[PDB]
Design an enzyme around this catalytic site. Sequence first.
Site, PDB file in Angstrom:
ATOM      1  N   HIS A  89     -23.915  51.422 -26.189  1.00 47.22           N
ATOM      2  CA  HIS A  89     -24.683  51.586 -24.979  1.00 47.22           C
ATOM      3  C   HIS A  89     -24.236  52.890 -24.354  1.00 47.22           C
ATOM      4  O   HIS A  89     -23.236  53.478 -24.758  1.00 47.22           O
ATOM      5  CB  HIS A  89     -24.422  50.456 -23.982  1.00 47.22           C
ATOM      6  CG  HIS A  89     -24.623  49.076 -24.529  1.00 47.22           C
ATOM      7  ND1 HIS A  89     -25.864  48.491 -24.651  1.00 47.22           N
ATOM      8  CD2 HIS A  89     -23.733  48.145 -24.944  1.00 47.22           C
ATOM      9  CE1 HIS A  89     -25.738  47.274 -25.142  1.00 47.22           C
ATOM     10  NE2 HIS A  89     -24.454  47.039 -25.333  1.00 47.22           N
ATOM     11  N   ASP A  92     -28.263  56.503 -18.433  1.00 46.25           N
ATOM     12  CA  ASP A  92     -29.136  57.616 -18.031  1.00 46.25           C
ATOM     13  C   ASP A  92     -29.460  57.367 -16.559  1.00 46.25           C
ATOM     14  O   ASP A  92     -30.149  56.389 -16.195  1.00 46.25           O
ATOM     15  CB  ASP A  92     -30.397  57.625 -18.921  1.00 46.25           C
ATOM     16  CG  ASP A  92     -31.445  58.700 -18.539  1.00 46.25           C
ATOM     17  OD1 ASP A  92     -31.347  59.414 -17.493  1.00 46.25           O
ATOM     18  OD2 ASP A  92     -32.421  58.812 -19.327  1.00 46.25           O
ATOM     19  N   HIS A  94     -31.500  58.760 -13.612  1.00 48.95           N
ATOM     20  CA  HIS A  94     -32.563  59.700 -13.224  1.00 48.95           C
ATOM     21  C   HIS A  94     -32.164  60.519 -12.012  1.00 48.95           C
ATOM     22  O   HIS A  94     -32.816  61.525 -11.720  1.00 48.95           O
ATOM     23  CB  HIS A  94     -33.873  58.968 -12.896  1.00 48.95           C
ATOM     24  CG  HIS A  94     -34.512  58.294 -14.076  1.00 48.95           C
ATOM     25  ND1 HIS A  94     -35.756  57.708 -14.004  1.00 48.95           N
ATOM     26  CD2 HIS A  94     -34.086  58.119 -15.349  1.00 48.95           C
ATOM     27  CE1 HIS A  94     -36.068  57.198 -15.180  1.00 48.95           C
ATOM     28  NE2 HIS A  94     -35.068  57.428 -16.012  1.00 48.95           N
ATOM     29  N   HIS A 129     -30.756  53.677 -16.494  1.00 49.87           N
ATOM     30  CA  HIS A 129     -30.965  52.772 -17.603  1.00 49.87           C
ATOM     31  C   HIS A 129     -30.166  53.205 -18.813  1.00 49.87           C
ATOM     32  O   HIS A 129     -29.781  54.375 -18.916  1.00 49.87           O
ATOM     33  CB  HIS A 129     -32.477  52.610 -17.944  1.00 49.87           C
ATOM     34  CG  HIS A 129     -33.151  53.865 -18.399  1.00 49.87           C
ATOM     35  ND1 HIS A 129     -33.129  54.288 -19.714  1.00 49.87           N
ATOM     36  CD2 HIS A 129     -33.895  54.777 -17.725  1.00 49.87           C
ATOM     37  CE1 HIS A 129     -33.838  55.406 -19.831  1.00 49.87           C
ATOM     38  NE2 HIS A 129     -34.323  55.715 -18.640  1.00 49.87           N
ATOM     39  N   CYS A 130     -29.931  52.258 -19.719  1.00 48.57           N
ATOM     40  CA  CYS A 130     -29.311  52.561 -21.003  1.00 48.57           C
ATOM     41  C   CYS A 130     -30.333  53.266 -21.911  1.00 48.57           C
ATOM     42  O   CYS A 130     -31.529  52.910 -21.933  1.00 48.57           O
ATOM     43  CB  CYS A 130     -28.797  51.278 -21.657  1.00 48.57           C
ATOM     44  SG  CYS A 130     -27.852  51.536 -23.213  1.00 48.57           S
ATOM     45  N   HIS A 139     -33.354  48.445 -25.376  1.00 48.33           N
ATOM     46  CA  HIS A 139     -32.252  48.200 -24.460  1.00 48.33           C
ATOM     47  C   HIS A 139     -32.770  48.082 -23.039  1.00 48.33           C
ATOM     48  O   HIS A 139     -32.315  47.220 -22.281  1.00 48.33           O
ATOM     49  CB  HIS A 139     -31.201  49.305 -24.579  1.00 48.33           C
ATOM     50  CG  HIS A 139     -30.264  49.116 -25.731  1.00 48.33           C
ATOM     51  ND1 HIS A 139     -28.892  49.085 -25.582  1.00 48.33           N
ATOM     52  CD2 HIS A 139     -30.502  48.905 -27.050  1.00 48.33           C
ATOM     53  CE1 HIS A 139     -28.328  48.893 -26.760  1.00 48.33           C
ATOM     54  NE2 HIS A 139     -29.279  48.788 -27.667  1.00 48.33           N
ATOM     55  N   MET A 144     -31.597  46.380 -19.413  1.00 48.20           N
ATOM     56  CA  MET A 144     -30.622  47.387 -19.029  1.00 48.20           C
ATOM     57  C   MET A 144     -31.147  48.505 -18.149  1.00 48.20           C
ATOM     58  O   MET A 144     -31.315  49.661 -18.616  1.00 48.20           O
ATOM     59  CB  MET A 144     -29.884  47.978 -20.247  1.00 48.20           C
ATOM     60  CG  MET A 144     -29.078  46.958 -21.062  1.00 48.20           C
ATOM     61  SD  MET A 144     -27.868  47.722 -22.169  1.00 48.20           S
ATOM     62  CE  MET A 144     -26.647  48.384 -21.024  1.00 48.20           C
ATOM     63  N   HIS A 249     -46.919  44.314  -3.491  1.00 48.35           N
ATOM     64  CA  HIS A 249     -47.711  43.915  -2.344  1.00 48.35           C
ATOM     65  C   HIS A 249     -46.955  42.798  -1.603  1.00 48.35           C
ATOM     66  O   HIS A 249     -46.312  41.932  -2.243  1.00 48.35           O
ATOM     67  CB  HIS A 249     -49.058  43.423  -2.842  1.00 48.35           C
ATOM     68  CG  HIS A 249     -49.911  42.789  -1.784  1.00 48.35           C
ATOM     69  ND1 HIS A 249     -50.686  43.527  -0.908  1.00 48.35           N
ATOM     70  CD2 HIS A 249     -50.136  41.487  -1.486  1.00 48.35           C
ATOM     71  CE1 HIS A 249     -51.329  42.702  -0.099  1.00 48.35           C
ATOM     72  NE2 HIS A 249     -51.017  41.462  -0.431  1.00 48.35           N
ATOM     73  N   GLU A 273     -51.391  48.411   1.823  1.00 46.20           N
ATOM     74  CA  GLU A 273     -51.513  47.015   1.412  1.00 46.20           C
ATOM     75  C   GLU A 273     -50.760  46.756   0.080  1.00 46.20           C
ATOM     76  O   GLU A 273     -50.050  45.751  -0.070  1.00 46.20           O
ATOM     77  CB  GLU A 273     -52.983  46.610   1.328  1.00 46.20           C
ATOM     78  CG  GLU A 273     -53.808  47.397   0.298  1.00 46.20           C
ATOM     79  CD  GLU A 273     -55.296  47.145   0.449  1.00 46.20           C
ATOM     80  OE1 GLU A 273     -55.733  45.978   0.498  1.00 46.20           O
ATOM     81  OE2 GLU A 273     -56.054  48.113   0.494  1.00 46.20           O
ATOM     82  N   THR A 274     -50.925  47.686  -0.862  1.00 49.74           N
ATOM     83  CA  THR A 274     -50.388  47.592  -2.199  1.00 49.74           C
ATOM     84  C   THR A 274     -49.953  49.021  -2.479  1.00 49.74           C
ATOM     85  O   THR A 274     -50.655  49.969  -2.098  1.00 49.74           O
ATOM     86  CB  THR A 274     -51.481  47.105  -3.167  1.00 49.74           C
ATOM     87  OG1 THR A 274     -51.874  45.783  -2.779  1.00 49.74           O
ATOM     88  CG2 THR A 274     -50.997  47.033  -4.637  1.00 49.74           C
ATOM     89  N   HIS A 300     -49.433  43.012  -7.662  1.00 48.55           N
ATOM     90  CA  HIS A 300     -50.817  42.628  -7.349  1.00 48.55           C
ATOM     91  C   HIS A 300     -51.826  42.856  -8.478  1.00 48.55           C
ATOM     92  O   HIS A 300     -53.032  43.031  -8.236  1.00 48.55           O
ATOM     93  CB  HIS A 300     -51.324  43.216  -6.017  1.00 48.55           C
ATOM     94  CG  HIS A 300     -52.355  42.354  -5.348  1.00 48.55           C
ATOM     95  ND1 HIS A 300     -53.553  42.020  -5.945  1.00 48.55           N
ATOM     96  CD2 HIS A 300     -52.346  41.724  -4.152  1.00 48.55           C
ATOM     97  CE1 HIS A 300     -54.260  41.266  -5.127  1.00 48.55           C
ATOM     98  NE2 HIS A 300     -53.537  41.051  -4.043  1.00 48.55           N
TER      99      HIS A 300
HETATM  100 CU   LIG Z   1     -27.748  49.487 -23.991  1.00 50.05          CU
HETATM  101 CU   LIG Z   2     -53.981  40.023  -2.211  1.00 49.40          CU
HETATM  102 CU   LIG Z   3     -35.507  57.192 -18.077  1.00 49.62          CU
END
Ligand SMILES: [Cu+2]
Ligand SMILES: [Cu+2]
Ligand SMILES: [Cu+2]
Lengths: 336, 336, 336
Positions: A89, A92, A94, A129-130, A139, A144, A249, A273-274, A300
Amino acid sequence: QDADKLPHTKVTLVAPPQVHPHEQATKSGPKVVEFTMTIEEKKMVIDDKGTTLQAMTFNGSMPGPTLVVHEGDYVQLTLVNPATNAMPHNVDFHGATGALGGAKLTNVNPGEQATLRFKADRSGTFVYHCAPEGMVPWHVVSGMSGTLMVLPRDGLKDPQGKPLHYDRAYTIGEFDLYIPKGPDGKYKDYATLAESYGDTVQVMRTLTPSHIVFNGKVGALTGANALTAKVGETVLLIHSQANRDTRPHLIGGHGDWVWETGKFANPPQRDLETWFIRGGSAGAALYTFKQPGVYAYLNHNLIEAFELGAAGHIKVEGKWNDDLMKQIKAPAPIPR
Amino acid sequence: QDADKLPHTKVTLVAPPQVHPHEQATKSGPKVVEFTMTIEEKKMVIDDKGTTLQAMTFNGSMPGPTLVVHEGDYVQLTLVNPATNAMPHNVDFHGATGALGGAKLTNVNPGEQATLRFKADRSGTFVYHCAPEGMVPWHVVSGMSGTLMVLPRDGLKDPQGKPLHYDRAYTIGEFDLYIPKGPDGKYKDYATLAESYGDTVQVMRTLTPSHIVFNGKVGALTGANALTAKVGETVLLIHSQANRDTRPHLIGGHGDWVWETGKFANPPQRDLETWFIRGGSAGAALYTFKQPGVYAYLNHNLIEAFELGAAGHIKVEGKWNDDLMKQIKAPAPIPR
Amino acid sequence: QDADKLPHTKVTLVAPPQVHPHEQATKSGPKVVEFTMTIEEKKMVIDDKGTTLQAMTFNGSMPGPTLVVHEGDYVQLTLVNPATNAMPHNVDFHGATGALGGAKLTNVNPGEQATLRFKADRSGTFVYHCAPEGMVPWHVVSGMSGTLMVLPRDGLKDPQGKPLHYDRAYTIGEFDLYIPKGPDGKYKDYATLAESYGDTVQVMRTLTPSHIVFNGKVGALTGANALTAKVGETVLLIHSQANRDTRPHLIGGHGDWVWETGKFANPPQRDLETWFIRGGSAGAALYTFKQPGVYAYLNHNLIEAFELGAAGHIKVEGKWNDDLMKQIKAPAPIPR
Ligand SMILES: [Cu+2]
Ligand SMILES: [Cu+2]
Ligand SMILES: [Cu+2]
Ligand SMILES: [Cu+2]
Ligand SMILES: [Cu+2]
Ligand SMILES: [Cu+2]
Ligand SMILES: [Zn+2]
Ligand SMILES: [Zn+2]
Ligand SMILES: [Zn+2]
């Protein structure tokens, strides 16, 4: 520059849906904030019919815990891969710049551990994330991922530059799962993680999840586990999806201020709303509760929410406001 | 008005991932910019197992080349459909106003050619694509799309009105492909373009691509063909998807300034981890490299990227910055 | 507060694609605006091969009619479920705060009716939909959704605060439909609504619609039913999708000003080629026609539009403008 001149703080992580104690606006200065996380592979029951996932997690949970720093801090992570695990493993971020998010500098076979530092020079919620070479989607979809929140030093801001705050932060990782089925059309159970692999890849390639779940399980954020707030309280709802789009939502509610792309140097949008979380990203919404009751927080696409599991509840205490909403006439026969 | 009073320039197009030489900010005035493009139908190998696509392209490439003008210019395209092709074709510029993007005025049977002019009165990256009546999705998914970039006359701008620039422009067309399979479950090879049709439509209708590729092939922007930059350099990454949503992400990097909807009169967003290109649109991101190394540029649905092919590399030269990122402790045994 | 001090107005709803008469900017004051809607279950033919949908609708139409108020008004809805229907129903207004959008206070078995009031304190287009416990996606995908538009009191505004207006409003509900197929691979016809259920759920879970339609039918907004405008006219295109993402585009046109998230206190974006409506939301675009002709308004996943039905036409009268677009050379042989 130089990070070595700076004070250190150690942060003790907490399990989702909670977020470890932190300040929003701070008078404090750039520190080197130290975290440690320990990868754990494990079988998990993901729904109410005992279907299991050969999962992989940071710190035992889906999602991983949320790490919080301020813009200008340095994140320093000790990533530990116990010999009780079967896979290599890495990680990463971001939020980080260079070496593929830190994946190249954090490759840890079982029995190993590594320590990464990067400068968190950009505010926002960011997925981590891995990403092990040759094995990235597997993964990630097996659990992960998590969030790094990098708050502005002077805290959150509205489009006009006015201060914003939350009283309670919650963290929701949404997970599109690809559970294989047998000739009998029942979900497959696997003795080991390695054995789930080939079948899983083939479901993945159909781009159709078998399950889509908040925080590791259908019903994870319901019943005793429902989220909680009070009328008058402001919550920050952090929503990560490391692999697939989703559309949060709040039923009966709104997104008062929303950073759908999750990046706090941008003005947020209001009254949503969403909203939309792009797969490979984390977003953030503020909401101040005005009515008591049970709210649903969900994806939603309603199929993905109710059929597939992308839905949770928020139980809110306080006083009903008839100005906002009033049952004028309850259900009764249609007048003859 | 009147376009006939204006000077003409002829532009010589170049193949993706490059973009033909152009100015950003210009002291020059509205011209009638002349382009010519020649449709070419052809079989293409799209992956590393010799699967082929009965493709259709502008100028021999997926995507078509990127055409560049400034706001106020007039685009003048001579569209040529050689008698060596089997289909009629036309062109729909999303940058253009009227006649269905120009599709109605550009219907060219094999052996024909037509010339369209429209005013590029709106800045942004805009998709263009073939749209022959009764056959629109097929021509688009088989490769017939590209980008028209209409730069503001005074060049690119941040949300505060400050200037922005790029040193190098790259153009990425992402292509969701729907390759039919035989009873043996192997991909079908077709002797002619017309013969791929019926089977292809049926895969299309499942809305599940067999392949999703940058610039015509799995691995198209990798190895010798990787994109390149230097620490200190600003790149503009133009990303078109004429049919399906995608979510660009630069691993180890960010979108410094991003116009996800691709329209330069709008303020861009900053610090993005992952952005969103709506199917039927082109977007643009600026990034200034700060660390050397190989970066991945990809669709951050990781299945679509690693399983299906929506991923490329950027090889970046320069000096590592330990302030931004530092391997504190390399992988080593977990202390007993 | 107190809503009881306020004057009442009764609004007479109209069928999509029209929107009932209303003012944009108003000198008038907060009222209690009264609406009544009557649920109707019914079989509908949804395409040109006689495929039917066991549908459920507000007021007989897909989508429901659009309700219009101003920010500060109170919406007061009498929801009627005739004994000629088979299901219970309710209503969830995303424009509303508390009780799950009003779903909890509006549960109406066949033969019943209820009256809800809520304050429309937030401007934007907002979806409303039926949300009966245990049955939410089914009722939504079978047709039970529409839009509430809450206009700012001083009407629409550009990002600089300048006024915007429309001359004609049109309302488009897009509906992802999940029609089951028999062993013969023909669509299933059902004698009753209850009987469509189990099979429908199973198609839903594949997340692959059989049909995606504007306003209830393939071709609903084409031919005699095409939308209409004139060169010089500004239209507001309201686009709701209560369950699935869509990406509106006007072929030959643009989104002059677009609120893709549908919330008018936010600045809109300009010059859009394609915008994005998040499933569970309604958005709004302004366009001022500059060229006459037939335009296509569509979901720019072209498969979803042309294969599956998410496409309509706008027939526009007026004078061609050769400055905007000119056929320089019509199709003719390639010069030898
Ligand atoms: Cu991993
Ligand atoms: Cu709705
Ligand atoms: Cu990524
Ligand atoms: Cu063509
Ligand atoms: Cu188009
Ligand atoms: Cu209903
Ligand atoms: Zn507070
Ligand atoms: Zn530069
Ligand atoms: Zn007007």
